[PDB]
Structures are given as structure tokens and as C-alpha cells.
């Protein structure tokens, strides 16, 4: 059934599962033509497929060439996402194939369910959670690799860097969703907070700064304060 606040901790058990988020698959700019009509231009996108237990990310880069000559692109985007997730499962050894795939948007259920027809023991699940994975293109190294791509490409990352050397999956996912929540609500402030101190750097093989345990606590407090504030601004509370 649907994933929600109650069955949240199921993410960190030892059943392999992946989150799939399709929000950044079909990305446009919207501009005016000479005649004054509005037109779109697609830019490169990505499927954000993530194992919440291990941090392994399978960033499938969607090159704008895939839309060329195609109609109803937003619908096609959902089928392409499923087509690529399918192929990713089929590329993995049997013992690494997920037992569940959780889609962040319910419109993905039917496309994934048809691409996975022959994979009847993999359960495709929706969710009631409001996960911030759209903000993934606010992570500089991810936005960079997507925008530079010249062809379809799969790039693998660990979205938790080395955190699991020291904290649990549960804690690591909570840090990740907090950081992405903040970047989503106010990217400029979120990014200021992360980089302010020029002496905390990001390893070449990492996505986030090499904070000590204490500095993560400060950071996480700052990201929480950011989020609450923006909410008062949104609703006047």
C-alpha cells in the first residue's frame, strides 16, 4: 500500500527498495516567439532513483534529444521514466534488484506497473509523503552533470557522502530530506548556510561539505529555522 508517516521506518530495513522521482525528467524554459506566441525549450533532465538505505543514487540523465519530434511530452516523460527504471532493474544482478519501487508521484504507477509486468514480485508503491526530491537539481554537482551532458548517460553517486560511517540510515535520510526541503523552500538561503565558512570544503568525490558532527548540528538547526520562517511568510502565522 501507500507509504506514509506510519510505515516510515520500513525504508531502513534490509529489503532492497528504491525511490523514483520523475519531477526533473521533462524540464522547460518558457519564452515568447517573434510573433508574440509562447513556446517552450527543453533542457536536459534526470530521473532521480535512490536507495534510501544505502544512499546509492542512480541519476539517469535525460538528454533533450529524446523529445525530438514527440508529442504530449509530459505524458511521454512518465513512460520514459518507467522505461529507464525498468532497464536499470534489468541491468542489476538478481540479488541487487529491489523488492519495492516507491514513486513520488502517483501518475508514475501505471507506466511503471506496465514496464515491470514481467517483474510481478516487485511491488510498485505510491506515497502520501511530500518528499523534496525535486530540489535535487539544487545540488550543484548534480545540476552540473545534467546540464553538461551531450548524450543519455547514467551517473552514480552516494547521496549521503560518507555519513553512514557515523550515523544510521534513518538519520542520514532525515538529514537528506531536511537539506532538500530547505533548498526547495529558499534555495539562496539554503546554499548560503552550507558554504558560508570557506574553510569547510566539499571533497571531490562528495556532494556536501565535510562538516564535523558538531557542525552538522548547527547546520541542521539553521536549516530548520529557515524552513519554519519561510512558512510564516507563506501563510502569515
Amino acid at each position: 500500500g501507500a507509504m506514509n508517516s506510519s510505515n516510515y521506518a520500513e525504508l531502513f530495513n534490509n529489503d532492497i527498495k528504491l525511490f523514483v522521482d520523475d519531477t526533473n525528467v521533462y524540464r522547460v524554459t518558457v519564452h515568447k516567439t517573434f510573433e508574440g506566441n509562447v513556446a517552450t525549450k527543453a533542457i536536459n533532465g534526470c530521473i532521480f532513483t535512490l536507495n534510501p538505505k544505502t544512499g546509492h543514487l542512480f541519476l539517469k540523465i535525460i538528454h533533450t534529444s529524446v523529445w525530438a519530434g514527440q508529442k504530449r511530452l509530459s505524458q511521454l516523460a512518465k513512460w520514459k521514466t518507467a522505461e529507464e527504471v525498468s532497464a536499470l532493474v534489468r541491468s542489476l544482478p538478481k540479488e541487487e534488484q529491489p523488492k519495492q519501487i516507491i514513486v513520488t508521484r502517483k501518475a508514475m504507477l501505471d507506466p511503471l506497473e506496465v514496464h515491470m509486468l514481467d517483474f510481478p514480485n516487485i511491488a510498485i508503491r505510491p506515497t502520501e509523503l511530500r518528499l523534496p526530491f525535486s530540489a535535487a537539481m539544487s545540488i550543484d554537482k548534480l545540476s552540473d552533470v545534467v546540464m553538461k551532458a551531450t548524450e543519455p548517460q547514467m551517473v552514480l553517486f552516494n547521496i549521503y557522502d560518507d555519513w553512514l560511517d557515523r550515523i544510521s540510515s534513518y538519520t542520514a535520510f532525515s538529514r537528506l530530506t531536511l537539506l532538500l526541503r530547505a533548498l526547495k523552500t529558499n534555495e539562496e538561503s539554503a546554499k548560503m548556510i552550507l558554504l558560508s565558512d570557506p574553510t569547510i570544503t566539499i571533497k571531490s568525490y562528495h556532494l556536501w561539505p565535510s562538516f564535523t558532527d558538531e557542525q552538522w548540528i548547527t547546520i541542521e538547526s539553521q536549516m530548520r529555522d529557515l524552513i519554519l520562517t519561510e512558512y510564516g511568510r507563506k501563510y502569515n502565522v
Binding site: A82, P111, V114, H115, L117
Partner: protein, 300 residues
């Protein structure tokens, strides 16, 4: 014209024959139905005055033998039987007519309703859905489940309707994942029409049989089957033009005949709104669309 005699009517029951039905009181002298039009299938069905659950009945065709009804007080229901002694059968029928204890199948000459409801229904196909090859007639009731239902328990009592599943191995070609799920013309024409049903008349026949089973017995898995076969056509972009025009007639008389107080459970909002208004075939069901709006604008 043919006859179905009844030995007796020992328990109060409402008897139906096709779209007609009569109330019969406990131990009222009732001894059958006469003047039944030869040339179509027919259904004789029952609902006891005491147990308004379990509607049940028998599909039959008078050309396939001499059939009669007889109450069984052990099993507690009216059973259909075959008389093989043709002489002994003309005799009972004559003596019962002579005594005028039989109702006349009450057809208006202007009325083609039953023909329209049963145009493509064949007794031979019914006996493949309701498998019981020792009888020439077929028993159906409110509670029987379908093969597809059983897959998600006693197969002897199963409605072997043709299994339709839009998210199946059968429904989608490898590589046409998106095309076939949006445009079922492949499930419909190649896998079902040319593959399983062989032609549109057998397809239409099972569709019509499913509807009648839902209407007469409130058989829930028949309703499911009827809607599935409607949806498969309406969700195909490429349909023979002869099928579309006949479908509009088929659906029109089915909607026309439905009791008004049953549309709630018998009509699936989603399928109809998709068929009438969202599907490839929204424009091909002019009569079915006109009668649905003037009779059940609520569900829409």
C-alpha cells in the same frame, strides 16, 4: 412457439422469463409458460418470496430439447430438467394448456427488445462459460464467481468468462509498453477478436450474456466482465466500423432495459464517463450517449 411446463409451484416465488416476470403464490396451480418464441435463447429465473437473496435461473433454447421445471424440496429450489420421452411431453403440455394453467410469454409484436438484448448470444457459447455438459441448459445465480475473480474457489460453479486484464502479459506487446496501454487496438483486434473470439459476434455474444447475468441475477463478476469488454473497445483507437455501430445498438437496448433503481451498483461511473466522453470512441455511441444523459445524468 414452445412451452416450458412446471410440475407444480409449492413455494411462493417470483418467476421471470426473459424481461417479464410473474408473482406465484404458495401452492397456486401454476404449470408453465407457453408461446415462448422459438429462435432465441431464453432465461427462466426465480426469487423466492422468503429469501430475496439468491436470484437463480436457467439459460435454455427450446430447439435443443423439451425442458420443464420442478421444485426440489431437499435442495429447496425450482430445477430445470429435460424430458427425453417426446410423446410423454406433448401429453403433459397439451393437458396443461387444455386446463389453461399456463401463462403466455407476453410479447408485443412491435417489440424487438429481447432480440436486441440477445442478438449474438448462442447456447453453444453459454455452455462453455457455464460448463456442465450433462445438461443442455445452464444454471446461473447471484453468488457464482468468475474465473478471473477466483484467481484473486470451487471451479465447477465458475463463470468461465474470457479473462481481460489491461496490465497483463496478454494486453501488451514487449517494446510497445506505452502504445498498447494507451491504445488497446492490439489487445482488441489481434489477441481477442482474431485470437480468442475469432469474430465480433462471439465477442458481442459474451458481452451480452455478461450484461444479462448482471441484470437478472445481480451477478457482480458479470457486471465486471461486461464493463471490461465495453472498455476494451472504447479504449481502442482502431475498431471496425461495423463493430462500433452495432455496439451503440447493443448498449442502447441494455441501458434502456435496466431497471432505473439499479443503476447505482450495475453501472461503473469510470468506464461510462471514459467511454462516452474521454475515449477514442466518444463520438461513436450517439444513441447510447443520448439515452444515458436523459435517464441517468446523475452518474455522469
Amino acid at each position: 412457439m414452445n412451452t416450458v411446463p412446471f410440475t407444480s409451484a409449492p413455494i411462493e416465488v417470483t418467476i421471470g422469463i426473459d424481461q417479464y416476470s410473474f408473482n406465484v403464490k404458495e401452492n397456486q396451480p401454476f404449470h408453465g409458460i407457453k408461446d415462448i418464441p422459438i429462435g432465441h435463447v431464453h432465461v427462466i429465473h426465480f426469487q423466492h418470496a422468503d429469501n430475496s437473496s439468491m436470484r437463480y435461473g436457467y439459460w435454455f433454447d427450446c430447439r435443443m430439447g423439451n425442458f420443464y421445471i420442478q421444485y426440489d424440496p431437499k435442495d429447496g429450489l425450482y430445477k430445470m430438467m429435460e424430458e427425453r420421452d417426446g410423446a410423454k411431453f406433448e401429453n403433459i403440455v397439451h393437458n396443461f394448456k387444455e386446463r389453461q394453467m399456463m401463462v403466455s410469454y407476453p410479447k408485443i409484436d412491435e417489440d424487438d427488445t429481447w432480440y436486441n438484448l440477445t442478438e449474438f448470444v448462442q447456447m453453444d457459447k453459454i455452455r462453455k462459460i457455464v460448463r456442465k455438459d450433462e445438461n443442455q441448459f445452464s444454471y446461473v445465480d447471484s453468488s457464482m464467481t468468475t474465473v478471473q475473480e477466483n484467481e484473486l474457489s470451487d471451479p465447477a460453479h465458475s463463470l468461465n468468462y474470457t479473462v481481460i486484464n489491461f496490465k497483463s502479459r496478454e494486453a501488451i506487446r514487449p517494446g510497445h509498453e506505452m502504445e498498447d496501454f494507451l491504445d488497446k487496438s492490439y489487445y482488441l483486434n489481434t489477441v481477442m477478436l482474431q485470437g480468442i473470439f475469432k469474430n465480433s459476434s462471439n465477442y458481442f455474444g459474451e458481452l451480452q450474456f455478461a450484461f444479462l447475468n448482471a441484470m437478472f441475477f445481480g451477478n457482480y463478476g458479470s457486471s465486471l466482465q461486461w464493463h471490461a469488454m465495453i472498455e476494451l473497445i472504447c479504449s481502442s483507437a482502431t475498431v471496425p466500423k461495423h463493430m462500433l455501430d452495432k455496439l451503440d445498438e447493443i448498449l442502447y437496448y441494455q441501458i434502456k432495459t435496466l431497471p432505473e433503481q439499479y443503476s447505482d451498483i450495475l453501472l461503473n461511473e469510470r468506464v461510462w464517463n471514459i467511454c462516452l466522453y474521454s475515449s477514442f470512441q466518444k463520438n461513436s455511441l450517439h444513441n447510447t450517449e443520448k439515452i444515458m444523459e436523459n435517464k441517468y445524468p446523475e452518474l455522469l
